[model samples]
Target: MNEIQKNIDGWEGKDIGQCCNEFIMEGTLTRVGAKHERHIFLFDGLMICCKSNHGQPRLPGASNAEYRLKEKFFMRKVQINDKDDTNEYKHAFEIILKDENSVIFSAKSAEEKNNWMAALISLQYRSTLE
Candidate 1:
């Protein structure tokens, strides 16, 4: 006779993915109008975006702040209007939440910026498969 699988209530299947120290990249992130220091950004495959306190890679026991990347995350590149000829926002991008809240991230270089964008887009695609 076949048996029914018993599981905990409200428990979803396990989410398996990979991340490491190198997954952490440097960026200046701002949420809700306050500017933050350079942070270590990470994409932990469970649809969570995390940021460490500094530009350095994440280390063991380091504290991190997290943002849940829910469905309908809209992303785009935005230009910053700094009159002093600083292109700090040139390598920046913004993610818009479903509720219209947004967060901005500024990378140290254009290549790094593109890399981050590509990674995020890929993660979004992967999530759709599960």
Candidate 2:
């Protein structure tokens, strides 16, 4: 499980996004009160967050400056609370963990609910091999 982080390079990696885990999607943050530019990447069972360099996502093989590591989450021990359309942040939702700890995040309009829904769907499906 920890091995996955070794696959993902932090902002210090220089050549960020070279490759790593099964990438489902990437988005940013507006976690209610916290104001951190988190470049969130959705993986099979892992959720990797890297502080965006100057508030921008690191494109595969395109970014070299490196990003700082924020935190990570496990989807296997998780539950997402959808806020869908919110008055505070449009398209924002809650990402809840097993402990019930959660944060609010809103990807771009296109990377909204459907992308997350798809990511969650893939998390339990493709890797599931049912």
Candidate 3:
């Protein structure tokens, strides 16, 4: 099997999206916290999601320079590219959990969560190729 498919199958252990989906679909974070909750998608420590807490999708700045600007990506634009034949994908969630003061939960499906994780890995591998 190719690297993309293999990485996905291996990393998708337990489905990260499912872990967050229930909360997002049910809107549990709304009343749980007085302050608005935000989900940040990161691609190699960059902020892919612009304008937090408003549901506005925007990935500002150039990705070529490659600086660790703590950028977060919009969950939708990020995708796992399996077309490449030589690379390993990485997946991780840097969650900032807080209580009523700011308790937030990731709102996504098992598939989505897996994709985000896989995409980052793929992106990093592709970066090296560039």
| Candidate 1 lDDT score at position 48 | 27
Ranked candidates, highest lDDT first: 2, 1, 3
Per-residue alpha-carbon lDDT of candidate 3 for residues 1-130, written as tens digits (9 for 90 to 100): 1212211112222343444322111111111133443333342323222112432122353122111111233222333332211123222233321121212233334564444345444444454465
> Is 1 or 3 the stronger prediction by TM-score?
1
**What are the Cα lDDT values of the candidates?**
0.35, 0.55, 0.29
Candidate 2 or 1, higher lDDT: 2
TM-scores of all predicted structures: 0.40, 0.57, 0.28
Global CA lDDT computed for model 2: 0.55
- Candidate 2 scores a C-alpha RMSD against the true structure in Å of 6.9
Could you tell me the lDDT of residue 29 within candidate 2?
53
- Most accurate candidate by TM-score: 2
Write model 2 residue lDDT over 1-130, tens digit each, in one string: 2333433345233233454455566555555545545556765436666654353455565554344455465655555667666566555677674445777766566655666655655553544465
Residue 91, model 1, lDDT: 40
Task: Report the Cα RMSD per candidate.
Answer: 11.5, 6.9, 18.2
* Candidate 1: residue 104 Cα off by (Å): 0.7
Candidate 1 Cα misplacement greater than 4 A, ranges: 1-32, 38-41, 47-90, 97-101, 127-130
Decreasing TM-score order of the candidates: 2, 1, 3
lDDT of 1 at 12: 22
The local lDDT score (0 to 100) that residue 114 gets in candidate 1 is: 62
lDDT by residue for model 1 (1-130), tens? 0010110111122432223223323343433234553332332422223332333323244422222222222322212221122253344456542235555665555565566555555454454554
